[PDB]
Symmetry: D2
Subunit: 411 residues, 4 copies
Amino acid sequence: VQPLARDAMAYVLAGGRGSRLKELTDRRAKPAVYFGGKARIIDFALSNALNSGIRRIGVATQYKAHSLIRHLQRGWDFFRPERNESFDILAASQTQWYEGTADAVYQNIDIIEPYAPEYMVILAGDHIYKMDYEYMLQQHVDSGADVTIGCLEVPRMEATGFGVMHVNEKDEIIDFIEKPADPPGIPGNEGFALASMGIYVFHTKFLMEALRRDAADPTSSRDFGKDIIPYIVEHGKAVAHRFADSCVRSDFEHEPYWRDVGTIDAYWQANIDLTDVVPDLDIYDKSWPIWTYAEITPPAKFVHDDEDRRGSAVSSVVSGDCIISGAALNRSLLFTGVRANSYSRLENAVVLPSVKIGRHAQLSNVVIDHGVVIPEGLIVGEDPELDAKRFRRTESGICLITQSMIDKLDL
Amino acid sequence: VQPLARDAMAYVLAGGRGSRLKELTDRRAKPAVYFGGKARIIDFALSNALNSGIRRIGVATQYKAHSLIRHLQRGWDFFRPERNESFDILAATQWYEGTADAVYQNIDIIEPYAPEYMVILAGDHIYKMDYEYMLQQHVDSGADVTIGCLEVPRMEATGFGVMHVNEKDEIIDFIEKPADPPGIPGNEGFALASMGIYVFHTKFLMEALRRDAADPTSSRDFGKDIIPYIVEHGKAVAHRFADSCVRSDFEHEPYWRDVGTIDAYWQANIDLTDVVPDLDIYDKSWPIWTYAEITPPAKFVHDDEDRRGSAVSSVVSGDCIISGAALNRSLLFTGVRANSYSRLENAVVLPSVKIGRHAQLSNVVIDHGVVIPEGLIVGEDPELDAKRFRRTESGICLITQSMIDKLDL
Amino acid sequence: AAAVQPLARDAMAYVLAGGRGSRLKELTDRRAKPAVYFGGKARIIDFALSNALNSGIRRIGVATQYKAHSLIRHLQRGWDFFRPERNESFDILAASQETQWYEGTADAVYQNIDIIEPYAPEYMVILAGDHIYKMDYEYMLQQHVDSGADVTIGCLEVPRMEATGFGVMHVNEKDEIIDFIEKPADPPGIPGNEGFALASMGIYVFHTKFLMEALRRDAADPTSSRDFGKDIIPYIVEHGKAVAHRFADSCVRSDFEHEPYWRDVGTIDAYWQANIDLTDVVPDLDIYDKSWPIWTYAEITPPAKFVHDDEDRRGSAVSSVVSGDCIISGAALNRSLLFTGVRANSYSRLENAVVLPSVKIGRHAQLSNVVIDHGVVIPEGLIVGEDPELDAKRFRRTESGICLITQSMIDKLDL
Amino acid sequence: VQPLARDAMAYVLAGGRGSRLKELTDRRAKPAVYFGGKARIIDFALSNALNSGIRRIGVATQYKAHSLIRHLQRGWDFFRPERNESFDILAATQWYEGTADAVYQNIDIIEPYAPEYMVILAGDHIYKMDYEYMLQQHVDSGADVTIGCLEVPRMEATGFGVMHVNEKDEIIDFIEKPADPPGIPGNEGFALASMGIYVFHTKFLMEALRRDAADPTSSRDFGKDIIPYIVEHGKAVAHRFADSCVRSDFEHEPYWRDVGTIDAYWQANIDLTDVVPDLDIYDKSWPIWTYAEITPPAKFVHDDEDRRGSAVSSVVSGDCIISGAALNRSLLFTGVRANSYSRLENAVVLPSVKIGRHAQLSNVVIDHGVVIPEGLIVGEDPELDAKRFRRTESGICLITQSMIDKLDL
C-alpha cells in the first residue's frame, strides 16, 4: 500500500568528465553543463528523484566539480533532515579520488547506512530525461531481481554505440555486451535492442555486499557497468525495465525523451530544438517540473527599431536579464544575462549565461561558452577554414567558442 | 558610530485603496498592484527598508488584502527573529479607523521590539531611498517628526499636500492642495510635497498615537490629524528626497511615482520600454526584492509570410510564449500567452493574460488573467472602446474579464 | 498510474482550524484551539499538518476564523517551505470569503472553491485541526477508491460508553455507514462485537468533483447549518455511499506506543493530562519517533540551564520535560512540562505543572496541578495547590483540582 | 551616513589545524569543533560579520574540512546574491600555501564583488566583536592595516604574536611569541596580543597578495610575511578589542578564547555551567547563528533511592534523555542519552553521545558520537585513565570511540 519511494535513496553519479564536449567541460563536469535556458544537466535526474517521492538523495562528484558543488549547495538547499529528507553532496575523498563508479558508493557506505534505506536508486547524472522511479521500484520488488536496469528501446543500428542488455522472454538479462556490432534484438521485437540508461535499482543490503565484494577484488575496475552489473547478470538475477513504461511524457511530447548530449553537435542540437514550434522536450510542462538554481532577474528587453537596427528575437528562446539592443536573433537559445548589442546578429546560436555580443558581430551555428565576450565585428559561420583555425569546429559546422579562444585572437 | 537602522522599525501603511485606478483595484489593494514586469508596488518600500539596513518591518493592511497578504507571506519570508529580524503582517476590532489607528491597534506588537525609531512609509509609491539619511537628520535636528518631501516645481505641487518651510527647512505650515503652493525660501518656483514618509522616536510616536486615540473628533490619520498637530504645537522638519534618493548612473533624476491614475500607471510601465528609461531596473546596487518563481524562458515562435512572433521596443517576462504575435512598445508580465495573427501596441499586460488569435490591442492595460477573445479590436473605435471598457480621457483602455464577459462578439 | 502511483500525489488536505475550543476557557480567549501549544515545542495544528506532509500530500489549505492572528502567524512562520513551482502549495484561508464568517465547516470549503479548483486535485482529504494524532492518509485514500464510496470517514473504535460524546456512525458488517447520531445516549455497536462503537474523527475523504457539487447543494439549503458533520455527512449516508475507515488501520504507532494515540484535549483537565503524561517513563505518545516526525515553528535557542545546589535550593528537574531557553535557577521541578523560555527562580517549586512558553516563576512560589498560560509572570511567593477554595476563587480551577492561570487573573490580585 | 560594513567583505581563515586538540581534530578542522552546546567555533566569527552588517562572507577551508564545509552548506544557507549578499566557501599549483595565499588564489571570486574593504578573520576563536568600529578606525587613521589586539598582562602575551605600539597605537614592531613581551606606553604590565584580525582597503590587499606571491622567499603567510612587512614600510595601527567588543550586561570583561588545548577547551565549555558565566550565551542583543534542527525537549526520568535522572549545575540541550542518570557540573550537547545509574561530573559531552548504565565519568571531554560502555569508570585512576584515554596534565580525559574500541584495561 505504501509507495516504495519512501524507503528509497537516490544516488547520483556526477563525476563524469564529458570528454567529447571538449572545452565545454574543461573547467566544469558534464552534469554542471547548462541546458534549456535556465537549468543544468544534473537537475533532471535530481528533479526526477524529487518528483518520484524519493526523500533521500546523495550526489557523488569527482573531477572539476567546483561549479557543480556550488550549484548543488545553492540550488538544492531545501531538504531538512528532521523531516526525514536529506541531500548529501559527496565529493571525492570521500587518499584522493574514487577509483570508480562503484567505489563512489563503497567509500560512502557510512553515509548511507545511518539512513538505512530499503532501496538504492543509482542514477547517471549526465542525461536529460524525465522518469518516474516508482514504477522501477515496484518492478524490482515484484520480480525479486538482484538488480533492475533501466533500458532504452532503440533501433539495432543505433544500439551499436550503447551497452546492450541481452534479454529473454521475461525481460531477464542473460548477457551484457558493450558496443555490439550486431546488437541482440528483443525476443519477438527484433529491429529494436535494449540500451542501458545507467540506472540501477538495488535492495540496499544487497548493494552494500556487492560493493564490499567489489572492493576486496584486486582485478576490479570498481565500476557498476564493467564490474558490478556483469557479475550479477551471470551469478545473480538481472531484469530489464523499459523506459517507455515509466517515462513522464508530456501531451506535447511525441515520444519518450532522452538525450545523452555527449558531443558538441548533440549538445547544440538538443538545445536548438527547444526553439521549435513543437519541440521534442516540453519545458512548459507543469506536471513534472524541473527544479534548478535561479535568481530573481529583470525581464528580457528589446530596444531600437530604425532603418539600420532592430532589437528582436524570432524563432528563439530568451531568458531573463537579457538585453537585446539593436541585435537580430533567429533560431537561437539565450541563457540568463546575455547582452546583445547594436547591428549584431545571431542565428542557430546556443548562448550560455552572461555572454556579451559586441556591435556588428555576426555569428551562425555556434555554442558560446559562459561569460564569453564576443568582440565587436567578429564573424563566425561564414569562413569554415577561418572558423576552424580560431575555434573548436565540428565537422557538422558547429563552432564552440570560449574566452580562451577569443583571447588568442587579433587574427 | 553604529547605524541608526539597527535601531529602526519600518512601518508600512498598505491599506491604500487606489480608487482612481478603478477596476484595477476592485479585487486588490493598491500596494498589491503589479509593476515593472515582475514586482508589486509594495516591494519598493520594503526593499528600501531592507537595503537601508532596517531589520524590523511591519505592514498594516486593510482593503481587500487577500492577494497583498499572500504576496507578503510568500515573497517576504526570509526574516528570522533569532537574528533580530522581523516581518509582521498586521491585518485589520474590525476596521482600522485610519493610518494612525493602524499604528494604534498594533502597539503591543511594536513595544516588545522596543525600537528607538519608527519609519512610517507609504506602501503605494514607486521609488528608491536610503532611510539612513532621514534617521540621522531626525536625530541630529532634534525634531519631533521628520517628513520626506519632494522638490517639485510650483505648479505640479497643487495636487500635493505641500509643506510650508523656512530657511532651516523647519515646517511652519501644511496645506492640502494649495491653489498657489508656498515656495522654498531662496528657491521660489519649487515647493515641498509630502511623500507620506515620517520618521519618529518610538516613545514620542506612541504618545502622539495614544493622544489621537483619545480624541473622539480625530479622523485618526497621520496626514489629517497627527502631522498637522505636530506642525502647530511641536517641531516638524522636512527631509529632501533628492538628498537620500538612490539614483542609478543611468537615471537622469530622482525617480518617484504615485501611479495614482490609469494614465499615470500606464505611463510609468510603458516608459520602461524606452531605450533609456527613467527607472533603471537593471541596477544591482539597490535591488528590488519580490515574490518570484522559477519560470521557463520567454519563447518566440513562427516566422512566415503571414505571422511572426516577435517583440520590438518591448519588455517581456518569463513563462511568456509569443506565438505568431507581433508586439510593439509593450510591457508583458509573467505567463502571458499571445497567439497567432494577434498584435499588441502600447500595451501593459499583467500576468497570465491570454491573447486570442487575430486580436489587435492598442493603448491598453490588461488586468491579471484576462483571456482576450479571438479577433477583438481595441484602440480603433474610441466610442466603441469607451462603451465596452474603462477608457481614459487620453485614450488608454483598462480591460478586465468582467468587461469581456459583457461582450458577445 | 498502474496501481503504481500513490494517491497522495493527487490529493489536497483541507484542514478545518476555525475551532473555538470553548471548554478550554481562558486558554482560547485570544487564540484558536489549533493554535494551543502542546508537547513542549509544537502547537495542536502541527499534527494534522505533519500527517498530511508525511503521508505525501503536497497541497495544503488551512481554513481559519476565530481570533486566528496567532494561528496565521504560526503557519506563516513555520509552514513556509512549500514552493508552487514544485507542485506544492500551502494556503492560509482566513474568513472573509464578503464580510462576516464562514457559516460553518462546509461553507469553509464552499467559499474557497476558487482556490481549490485551479489545483484540480482528484481527492480531497478534509481534516480537523484541533486533534493530536498520527496517521498515514494514503491508507484511507486507497480504501476510498477501492470501495467506490462517496465519502470515507475516519473512525475511532472506542468503548460504547465513551462514544456518547462523539458523533457516532452506525455500520453494517462491511463498515458501510447506515446512520449517524450526534452524541447518542446509547450508541450503536459494531457487528461482531458490541461494547465498542465507531467514533468519527471528523476526517473525510472525497472525490473532489463529488465534494464540490455536494457543497454547493448545501449552500443552496437554508435549513442547513453548513457543517460537514451535521449536514454533508448525514445527507450522504442516505442518498449515497458512506464507508468507515478505522484509525487502527492507518494509525502510525511507534515501537514505544502500545495503543493508537488520539486526543481531543477539549477540556482543561484533558489538556493538562495529555501534556503531563509526556513526563512518564513510557509515554503513550512517542515524541522521539523520527519515522513520522512532527514539524513546527522553532527558533534557534540556547540550551536548558540548571543552577545552584545547596542547603536550601537546587535548580533541578525530576520526572520532567524541559525545552530550550529555559533557566532553572534554584528551582525544584517535578512531573512538570516546560515550554521554551521559562524562567523559574530560587526557592520556587513546580509540581504537576504544564508551563507554556516565556513564563516566569518568581522566587519562593509553589504551584501544584496547574496550567500556566503563555508569558504569565507568577508573583514571588504565590502558592497554588495548597487551598482549593482560595484557588477556586482566585483562578480557573477544575473539578479535578487543576488551576489554569492567566496574566489577567494574576494582576487583579489582592494580598 | 553610510555604514562601512555595506562595502566590506569578511574573509574567514578556517584552515586551523588545532593540532594540540589531538584526537578532537583528527577528522575535523578546529573551526568545526563544537562549542557552547549547539554551535561550532567558526559560528562566532561568522555571526560577528553578520551582526556587524557585513553581507559578503568568504570562508577559506583547508584540511579535514568535509565536516566544516557541510556545516556551512546547511547552517549558513540564507544569503541571496540578488540581494547584494554572498556566502562563498573557498576550498581548493595545489592547496593553500598559507593564509595570505588563501586570499590570492581567490582574487577571481573577490574582484567581481568589488568590496572597498576586506576584514580578514580567524575562524578558530570564540569572541563577540562589532567590526564597524574597526572599519571606521581604519579609514579615519589612514592606516594600511588595522589589527585587532587583545590587551593582556605581559606574561600572558608570551604565547601570542605581539605588537609594539608607540604612544598613538601605531605599530612599531611585531614579535612572534616573545619570552619578554614589550609593554604598552602609559600602562605597562600589559601588552597588545594579535587577534589575527586584519582590515585592509581591498585594492591595497590585492597588490599585497600579488607582491607576496611574487616573493620566492615567502611563507605565503599573513602575520609572518604580509603584516610585519607593512609594519616597516607602510602604516600599521592597532585596534583595541575592548573598544569594539560586544559585551553583554552580564559579562564582567571582554570575552575571547582560543581554546587551543584540551584543558582550555574543557575549561571554556564547563565555565558555561557557572551561575554567573563569563560568556553570556543568553544575550539576544548579539546572537550567534548556527546549524540547528528542530529537536524534542530535554527529558528527565526516574526518581528512586537507587537512581534519579536530573541535572545539577549543568547545561542540557535538546534531544537529551537523562534516564536515571546523575549529572553535575556538565555540559551536554544535542542528542545525548544517559542511562540508569550512570554519573557524569565535570563532563563536556558532545552531540549524540550515549552513556551506558552504571558508568561513572569525571573530568572528561567525550567526542561526538562516542558510545560509552556500560559500567565504565573514568576519574578514579589517573595512571589507568592515562593508559586508556588522552589524559591532560590537569587530569582531563578526552574520550574517542577509538580509545573505547581498543579499550580493554
